[PDB]
């Protein structure tokens, strides 16, 4: 146990003496800042395998070079060490983070534009300046760090000797006198922390008594680790209620809400934030300051109406057929739940046709809010929720105020008016985008979303395989130029009911009536259906031009 | 602020001064911590919350526990005196400080009414002549003892760890020195130990903490979790040693969930499946240790996987055919022997319907119920060894069926006997509504019942009629009151009722519900005589006359059914 060095540990990892029994870049950079800032590491748990049990278990190596496509699974042990070896039971991620940073690489898929066709390594600015962080660490590509901020690869601390690196900086003339001075202090801090410092601590033990020492660690070190601000806040908040049955009631509603229809995944966090919003509390932040005794008193005095409304909220989203896979913005339920609370609406709201227009007004808003790439439900959300809540109080007594909510949102910069580019992106959306279902719900508003339904390909994806298209006679150049489009909105439609024929056959053995067939089709924006698969592209580009103009109109206010 | 420095005396002294508080609400466990403390094992970093007096009256803080009383103080007391200056609310380390506090600063019949003889005050003690117990792996002996059980074992000198905080070092080192009860050489050993304690509670920096304000709790919290435990440490997840060697995580979770949904419900753990793995795959060692989870052992397990998966499910269903649920089967470690029997004989759901297995299922149930009625450790200690021997018995007798004869005798040799002692019999007749053992006793004493169809335990005389005030209308001595209301929950007022909660009976008194729902004189007479009800008083005043008469009727059946 006692103490130890990061260099010592990283090297036993390399010699494969430190292993792993079975089992975010920016976050690795954050460990390294905290480390160089002197935030100490906690104690780690280690298991020493007797040489007799060397073959008894299947150990795996830590990750050094990460590639989401190439190496993403912890590689198995290559050469079983010839002597005593250790397997880590706690601190795996902490160790892996140091390994990737000082001896490895990280390749993550770049977020590209919607038109789509990189091994980076850890670097530190020696002329690091603080940011209200203290030390700027970034995973960068070599050419992006050669930028004419003096960037240094932290990895060389493990490959070169201090004297060489200290000297390179001093012999660099791109740097002025005062600069080289700062750079040296910083480079030294790094070398003198990865090397020459007692940061690692480790409870170690053998097979027989491993049972006892894991439990000592759990008593002495933490048990039931804080789920961040979240379980803390819940803990803090529940501790200001008369009912010592409060903790449960929240978890209970969360469960009921997540079994409303086909299924949802809200968090206790949403319930707490909703509580604040519905209680007309002036701040809606998820902060312990806002979960005081006075604030939580209001919630406890109004819990039953608030719970009911949030449940009806999910019931309404499922009336519009949302589930855990298509609704990604749980933050959008909050305005809706304030509305059902302001008007004290009940389950009857979903049935009475008298409220049908208002339900379709809400859906218009929700869909358009979720169709925006991003910017509506992310940053600045707390100011928005506040101003949206306000709108509902001043003019919701009549009905949902879309006119006002639309412009309040424009003012906070979060307009729901789509640009020609945002519209062009929406017309090439892929099958998997959660935004796809909802675009179709808007474009095709007549459906019983309240009942089972799904999204399918007019021309089935099965036929879209390189051989099959070529058997029919598609230029080899156009192969794989169609298979990609087979999964794009112009070949996507909304169908009634749960989940082998070309569309024009299914549509003539299921739509015998010429007049009714022509209608279902024009209603699904299917203007024509060509019989040779080698004419699908003329179809695709035709439906798109039709849908593009239908998307513009449907998002015009 | 990261105070790496800090002593236990300082913490506890700030705890007593009500400056260290809590925002939100077992002895042996506390005792294990104290041994490890003196074994040098350090504490983890704690997280503390600074409260400026501008927000002092806004969050309802609570004190740590010191003198615990299941009946009186079982919840952290509210703040008696709020401090005027800045103060702290612990977020991490809540339990660890609450073990030091109670440690250095403070029954079985569960006759809840009795204040006396029913809540003995025990305080932490240490044997200064402690010695290595290579079984527990302990090197220091800490037990919670009462003053009498603390005062002449030749090698046990008990020191109340509490005086360390009230007396002076010199004084205690002197008391041990001027104690003629001790022997010269053994006086030296005591001193060395007493010193380590005084010098660990004081004079040694063991407490470490992060004191943070509201402004930046979010950030430093996150920083703490990065550098410290974020994966909530771990568990004895030997399941990993197998998803690895075997070529699974899903299958286990599946058996667990399916087994937990068989009847009205069960709450089994992944642990049982794995333990049954070794039990049913004939591995000579059933320990949940990592040693038996070897590549070659886990080879037999995946071959017997389909065979065991079924038996564990068949086991759970047999239990639900006996009315068992999460609420009434706390000792889930008793399923393991049952599963071996089903696997040995390769039975199926047809064991649950075919009348040819009735005598057999009833032999099993009797044993199971009897095993659970004992409040001692038939399924608490020496399990790996009992289970190992039961396996042998079941394997050598899987013909006529359950070797109950042999199983009882092997349990008797291992001291896990099921012959009931007269005193233990008497407490079974006084079992409360809550003790899960009660459900079973009723099913053992009333073996003719539809355990199959939905059923609930109810009270002959309804619980709602027993309110201090309600009994004054009928006129009862207020002398025996908080005890009469307790008897409303004991066995003589408890019965097995078919169906579910009948709100229509809670209102009526027994002679007003049986009298109508059972109109035939001959039928009622029997439904009742079968539920051990000889007479049913109609004046609530005579309840205690009914209780004693039934207790005598039930005591009779208990002695007949056991023994
Ligand atoms: Cl914000």
Author numbering:
A (entry chain B): 3 to 25, 32 to 125, 130 to 144, 148 to 163, 167 to 517, 523 to 580
B (entry chain A): 1 to 25, 32 to 112, 117 to 161, 163 to 258, 264 to 579
What does the published report state?
The BrxU protein contains DUF262 and DUF1524 domains, and shares 13% amino acid sequence identity with the single polypeptide type IV restriction enzyme GmrSD. Here, we have shown that BrxU is a promiscuous enzyme that uses a range of nucleotide and metal co-factors to recognise and cleave DNA that contains any of at least three different modifications, and this activity is dependent on the initial nucleotide-driven dissociation of BrxU dimers, and subsequent nucleotide hydrolysis.
Whilst using the first BrxU structure to analyse datasets from a range of BrxU crystals, a second dimeric structure with a differing conformation of BrxU was solved, this time to 2.85 Å. Our models described above for DNA-binding and dimer dissociation rely upon a great deal of flexibility. By aligning the two solved structures, domain movements were visualised within the BrxU dimer. The overall alignment provides an RMSD of 3.85 Å, indicating a poor average superposition. By aligning the lower resolution structure through one C-terminal domain of the higher resolution protomer, (which as independent domains aligned well at 0.58 Å), distinct relative movements of each of the other domains of the lower resolution structure can be observed. This level of movement confirms the flexibility of the BrxU dimer, and gives rise to an hypothesis that the 21 Å cleft might widen to accommodate a substrate DNA, with backbone phosphates supported by loops of the DUF1524 domain, as was seen for the observed sulphate and chloride ions. The structures reveal how nucleotide binding is blocked in the dimer form and reveals inherent flexibility that would allow for cycles of dimer separation.
